[PDB]
């Protein structure tokens, strides 16, 4: 089902790990058998004659028992160690083979499969899910088997050693079963309700953080923060219920558990008075069933973890066995070896699976003779790069055919097909290696003569003899240490060391100077001698050296010919002619709530009670042994009635104090979670638009920040305080009594307590070291994989997946060696742990026999001390591992404490800055030099000047995104210019009160949004800080020509346009934006492309409404419709961020 990828050695590993899992699991019950016999000899000899001052038989028997104990210790040492290692070794080996095969089948996975899903989903899937499988199949299975072992061994040693008492005990089990089971049903249902309610109230942060920009313009912080608080104050009503219910149930569980104790002790006191089951054989059944219970109880999550393992492994195996359409790895392909450069098309239709609601191919009918060069032209929006992608078959068209010499496209072995052609594209990307190595990846095996000859001939050798480390410089992440035009020249050097039979040239000459373009042109010209080359047209001044020239109008051969053949042919060509996360303290995570100190006080007093409950049961147990020495029945049985009651009194008091500690800290936690949620959100909204425009602080990650990390902080705040308090009581009076009683046994056993305790600590230290080194090696290989999940299309183009596969393996072999070290590191301390629990028995009891014989302390005292300390430490272990992960919520608190203090340079809350009373919309730019500090390499504005007068207009004509949106921003003061100044109304906008400035600049951006409110609530969002009269809405509702169609709707001002409001068109929700900008009576507009969904009339009506109040107040317009540009007051062009 899941262990396929297994050699034999894996199976031997697992099986020789399982048998010794069981032979470790069976190691306590045997221990209790011997404990029974030894306490029998002790109390027999003691009562039958106490000797505080012929007894050496006691010693003979106790040394015999010491051999038994330790010999048993050795047994568990070996079996523990082997269980751990062999299980985690089988884990490591199989997981390394898994990773490797998963990549090698993600590269074989087509681009349609890449068009479907996400590209961080994949890499995160890789990293996390492989760790998930690793921990799943890894070792939890070993521990689970030893759990079931100790269980069945506990019950069997019961029935074998005394059956009446075992039946008494095992009889009332089904009541504890019913109890903790309904505990589970209660708590689970309540968790579900709580989480569903939150995530119903956390889609608000995700719809007002997916759109940070429109908010931060229109001045919509506080409207949002309040849309959030209003929901957290719904969820508290269910938080509280869950608190009281879960903690009542927990108290019940302990009342019943202590009730069970009383029953058994009283019964198996009548059945010892009758001289039937002696103390030695009477304590055996008791403790063995106790151990059975505790182990089999404390290993449930080792089933949830296996379930996670399967749950992950499903999709991973689903992919490795997956097998695509035309395979990038199958050598099953009828590759010719000699062939012309014929490329004949016909009636090819092809649509996209990811985009099928727009026909992109419409039937192409072209011929390419062998060698003759056709040059392709066309306007913006037809799919040139698309067609190139097709030609090489990254897809399969619908109802047409391409061929080379009529030979089918389903013939060419894909390695042949994409190693025979070559393409330089818009931005051929460079991977993270040398120059010589990119070029070697050009083909794989070339010559240095080819190298320099291409390099030179590729117009691109001077910088090499200029570059630092001339031959081998490192073009790192996305070509930052370069010019522009060097990158296309180096791509051409790569593509020329390939010697293709068909060449493709796309927008590779966009930021060059003419001469280098002409060089590479003539170079590929003097290279084409029997082959074809297709080029996509940037400037129609160089196309002239073609055999034939082609244009497109919707994907069909529309205009075909040479220069003069088309110059009078009048189609399309003619019209185209002219991470520190600074650590935090503890004190700080606490100071995060010194406004619920009453709860902490109740809960920690109550906690110290609850936790100082063992030293009770130590002294109780001491007294039980004490009463059974001399033998006067009459008063014995009355004492034992007393002690059954005492257990009963502790069963009630335990209930109350458990329920308090639980409920109190539940309250404190819930409160602090609501406060940290609110505070962090409110702090998110107050950050300048850089921080949000990062690849790290996305909407996914921020929404996770809110919805889990807030929750997790409570771990480190409250529970860790309760837990320190508990263990201090659980093991402080332990040692205090045990010093009043054992002057010298106590020291000796204190000298072993740290091992049982610091299994976890030594493992945390060393496992943390190796987990760091691992995650580093994993992040190396993750780099190597992020590459071909980002730069996929290129890599399959060069067909050079198969080089990445081996490059990947080379690193994958890192973490596997990591695991093989972790095996031994983990196992030797685990075994000393489990191993050293027995050697303590041996030492302590043998030493106590020494003293008792010499006469230093009654046997009741050696049993006290030993129980108070050893069952002390063993209880400490379980307590601690009940907490929530403190390592994982002292970082979470760090990740919110860095989001709190981070001071934005543009404070969107500040109450300072020159407020101008009345505002004349005279906008001015002074050689503003601009670049996004995100991709900080291309200066978007290279010194720009613009100046508009009141009531007037500007309008920036040109090409798509040329540097035409950034102007829209540097007034809303999202970003600040790298250089340049935009002084407004005569004065410098780097001095105004930013909260004020955006209150005058109404904007209809390229893509208006409608929130999750009713329409009334939505437009009157157009102004905040003063509630909107219902007629104000209605007034603009007639202004932007929208009041009529409203009267058709169910709830005129009250219908709900949902999340994105899928109930709507493009021309109406765009129209609402005009309704929206106009309630503010905005001084200057910025009508960025309002008509990309505006129909004729919808715009042709509203332009009358756009301008009429725009009269007497400026506007910048950056759109694409000439018939608005013409009537404008002024004129500007933008070429590569420059005016001309």
């Amino acid at each position: 089902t899941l262990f396929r990828y297994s050699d034999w050695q894996d199976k031997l590993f697992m099986s020789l790990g399982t048998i010794m899992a069981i032979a470790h699991g069976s190691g306590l019950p045997l221990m209790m058998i011997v404990f029974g016999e030894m306490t029998d000899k002790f109390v027999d000899t003691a009562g039958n004659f106490s000797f505080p001052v012929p007894g050496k038989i006691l010693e003979e028997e106790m040394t015999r028992y010491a051999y038994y104990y330790s010999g048993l210790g050795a047994g568990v040492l070996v079996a523990a160690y082997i269980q751990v290692s062999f299980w985690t070794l089988a884990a490591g080996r199989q997981i390394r083979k898994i990773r490797q095969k998963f990549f090698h089948a993600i590269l074989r996975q087509e681009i349609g499969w890449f068009d479907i899903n996400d590209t961080t989903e994949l890499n995160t899937r890789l990293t996390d899910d492989i760790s998930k499988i690793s921990e799943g199949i890894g070792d939890k299975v070993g521990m689970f088997f030893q759990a079931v072992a100790t269980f069945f061994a506990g019950f069997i040693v019961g029935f074998i050693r005394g059956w009446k008492l075992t039946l008494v005990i095992m009889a009332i089990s089904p009541i504890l079963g019913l109890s903790a089971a309904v505990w589970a049903k209660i708590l689970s249902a309540f968790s579900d309700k709580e989480l569903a309610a939150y995530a119903k109230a956390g889609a608000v942060a995700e719809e007002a953080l997916g759109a940070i920009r429109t908010v931060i313009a229109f001045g919509g912080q506080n409207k949002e923060l309040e849309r959030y608080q209003k929901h957290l104050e719904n969820a508290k009503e269910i938080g509280i219920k869950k608190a009281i219910s879960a903690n009542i149930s927990m108290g019940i569980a302990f009342l019943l558990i202590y009730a069970s104790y009383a029953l058994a002790f009283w019964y198996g006191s009548t059945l010892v008075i009758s001289k039937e089951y002696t103390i030695g054989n009477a304590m055996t059944v008791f403790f063995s069933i106790l151990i059975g219970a505790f182990s089999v109880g404390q290993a449930a999550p080792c089933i949830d973890a296996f379930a996670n393992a399967r749950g992950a492994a499903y999709v991973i195996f689903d992919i490795i066995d997956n097998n695509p359409k035309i395979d990038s790895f199958s050598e099953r392909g009828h590759k010719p070896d000699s062939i012309k450069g014929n490329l004949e098309f016909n009636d090819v239709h092809f649509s996209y699976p990811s985009r099928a609601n727009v026909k992109i191919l419409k039937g192409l009918n072209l011929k390419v003779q062998s060698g003759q060069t056709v040059a392709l032209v066309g306007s913006s929006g037809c799919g040139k790069s698309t067609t190139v992608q097709l030609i090489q078959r990254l897809y399969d068209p619908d109802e047409g055919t391409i061929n080379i010499d009529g030979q089918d496209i389903r013939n060419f072995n894909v390695n042949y097909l994409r190693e025979i052609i070559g393409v330089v594209s818009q931005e051929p990307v460079l991977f993270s290696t040398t120059i010589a190595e990119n070029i070697c990846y050009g083909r794989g095996n070339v010559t240095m003569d080819e190298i320099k000859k291409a390099v030179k001939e590729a117009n691109a050798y001077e910088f090499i003899m200029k570059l630092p480390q001339k031959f081998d410089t490192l073009v790192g992440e996305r070509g930052a240490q370069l010019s522009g035009g060097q990158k296309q020249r180096i791509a051409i050097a790569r593509a020329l060391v390939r010697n293709p039979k068909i060449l493709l040239l796309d927008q590779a000459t966009s930021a060059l100077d003419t001469e280098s373009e002409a060089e590479v042109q003539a170079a590929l010209d003097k290279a084409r001698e029997g082959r074809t080359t297709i080029v996509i047209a940037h400037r129609l001044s160089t196309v002239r050296n073609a055999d034939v020239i082609a244009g497109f109008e919707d994907g069909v051969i529309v205009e075909q010919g040479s220069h003069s053949e088309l110059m009078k042919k009048e189609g399309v060509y003619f019209k185209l002619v002219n991470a520190n996360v600074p650590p935090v303290s503890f004190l700080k995570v606490l100071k995060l709530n010194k406004t619920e100190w009453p709860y902490f006080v109740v809960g920690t007093v109550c906690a110290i009670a609850n936790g100082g409950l063992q030293p009770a049961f130590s002294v109780i147990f001491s007294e039980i042994i004490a009463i059974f020495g001399p033998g006067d029945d009459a008063v014995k049985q009355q004492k034992c009635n007393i002690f059954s009651l005492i257990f009963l009194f502790l069963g009630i008091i335990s209930f109350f104090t458990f329920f308090l500690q639980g409920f109190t800290f539940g309250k404190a936690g819930e409160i602090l979670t609501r406060r940290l949620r609110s505070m962090a959100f409110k702090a998110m909204l107050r950050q300048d638009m850089s921080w949000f425009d990062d690849h790290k602080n996305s909407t996914g990650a921020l929404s996770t920040r809110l919805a889990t990390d807030a929750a997790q902080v409570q771990g480190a705040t409250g529970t860790r305080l309760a837990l320190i308090a508990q263990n201090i009581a659980n093991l402080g009076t332990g040692i205090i009594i045990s010093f009043i009683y054992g002057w010298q046994l106590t020291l000796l056993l204190l000298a072993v307590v740290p091992i049982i305790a610091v299994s976890g600590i030594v493992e945390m230290k060393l496992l943390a070291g190796n987990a760091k080194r691992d995650k580093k090696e994993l992040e190396a290989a993750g780099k190597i994989a992020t590459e071909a999940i980002e730069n996929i299309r290129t890599v399959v183009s060069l067909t050079q997946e198969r080089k990445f596969e081996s490059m990947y393996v080379e690193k994958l072999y890192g973490p596997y060696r990591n695991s093989v070290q972790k095996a031994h590191i983990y196992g030797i301390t685990f075994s000393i742990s489990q191993a050293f629990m027995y050697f303590s028995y041996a030492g302590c009891f043998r030493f106590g026999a020494y003293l008792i014989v010499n006469g230093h302390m009654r046997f009741r005292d050696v049993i006290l001390v030993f129980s108070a300390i050893v069952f002390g430490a063993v209880a400490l272990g379980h307590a601690s591992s009940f907490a929530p992960d403190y390592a994982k919520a002292k970082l979470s608190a760090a990740h919110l404490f860095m989001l709190f203090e981070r001071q934005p340079l543009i404070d969107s809350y500040s109450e300072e800055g020159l407020k101008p009373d009345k505002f004349e919309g005279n906008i001015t730019f002074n050689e503003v030099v601009f670049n996004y500090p995100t991709r900080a390499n291309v200066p978007v504005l290279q010194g720009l000047s613009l100046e508009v007068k009141k009531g007037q207009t500007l309008a920036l004509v040109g090409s798509s995104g040329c540097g035409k949106s950034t102007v829209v921003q540097l007034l809303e003061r999202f970003y600040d210019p790298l250089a340049g100044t935009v002084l407004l109304d005569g004065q410098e906008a780097k001095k105004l009160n930013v909260q004020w400035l955006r209150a005058q600049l109404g904007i209809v951006s390229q893509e208006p949004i409608l929130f999750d409110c009713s329409i009334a609530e939505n437009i009157a969002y157009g102004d905040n800080s003063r509630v909107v009269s219902q007629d104000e809405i209605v007034s603009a509702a007639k202004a932007a020509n929208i009041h009529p169609f409203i009267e058709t709707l169910p709830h005129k001002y009250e219908t709900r346009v949902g999340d994105k409001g899928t109930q709507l068109s493009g021309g109406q929700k765009q129209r609402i934006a005009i309704a929206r900008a106009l309630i503010r009576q905005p001084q200057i507009l910025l009508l960025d492309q309002a008509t990309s969904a505006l129909d004729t009339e919808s715009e042709k009506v509203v332009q009358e409404a756009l301008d009429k109040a725009r009269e007497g107040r400026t506007c910048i317009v950056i759109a694409h419709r000439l018939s608005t540009i013409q009537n404008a007051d002024l004129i500007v062009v933008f070429q590569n961020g420059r005016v001309k």
Partner: antibody
Amino acid sequence: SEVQLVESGGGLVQPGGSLRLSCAASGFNLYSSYIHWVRQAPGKGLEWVAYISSYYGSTSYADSVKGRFTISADTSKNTAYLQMNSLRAEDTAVYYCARSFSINGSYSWWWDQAAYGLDYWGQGTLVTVSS
Amino acid sequence: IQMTQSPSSLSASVGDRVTITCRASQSVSSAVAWYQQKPGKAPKLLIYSASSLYSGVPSRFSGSRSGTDFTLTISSLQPEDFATYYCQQGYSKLITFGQGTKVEIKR
């Protein structure tokens, strides 16, 4: 590197004004040690003003400024702000930043906050309070 | 928590025993310091805790404690001296630099 504390801001205000003085450290991590704000009188003497420790979240002002000034310590870019409100005429002094000492070398503990002295300083920005 | 550099504005000549007393408030208890500042430029740290020098500092400067009568004394007086020294004390969230002294050359 070598310990390099610089300042910023400051340069003009009248009585009844705000200001922000930004002490940017360079050469060490901020949250490892304490940070103070001395104020050198124009010609008279040298008087402490405040401090903040960003690893136990503990701030503390001298009397003459309490409630009015606010410190903060942005550990996303190694910066220590001091925001000032309602400046009088007895505050035209110059305002050096400073870093209190640590003995261990790479962090400072809570016990004896800055009782070993202040070692590294910046060069003061001069501020004024004239009408 | 008040500090008094008692012999303000000293007047000693080059090559002599030179003294400074900086009597504190009650019980700072060895947590005082001694800073020497040349005019206009930031103050230096000279010695701390009243006994033990900093780094890079010459070994001609003596720090002495007695109860709460402190003392910073000199005998070398290389003319790189002649500035103003301030003996800050630091205790319980309250730090006070006291009003220091100076050293005038003789003529």
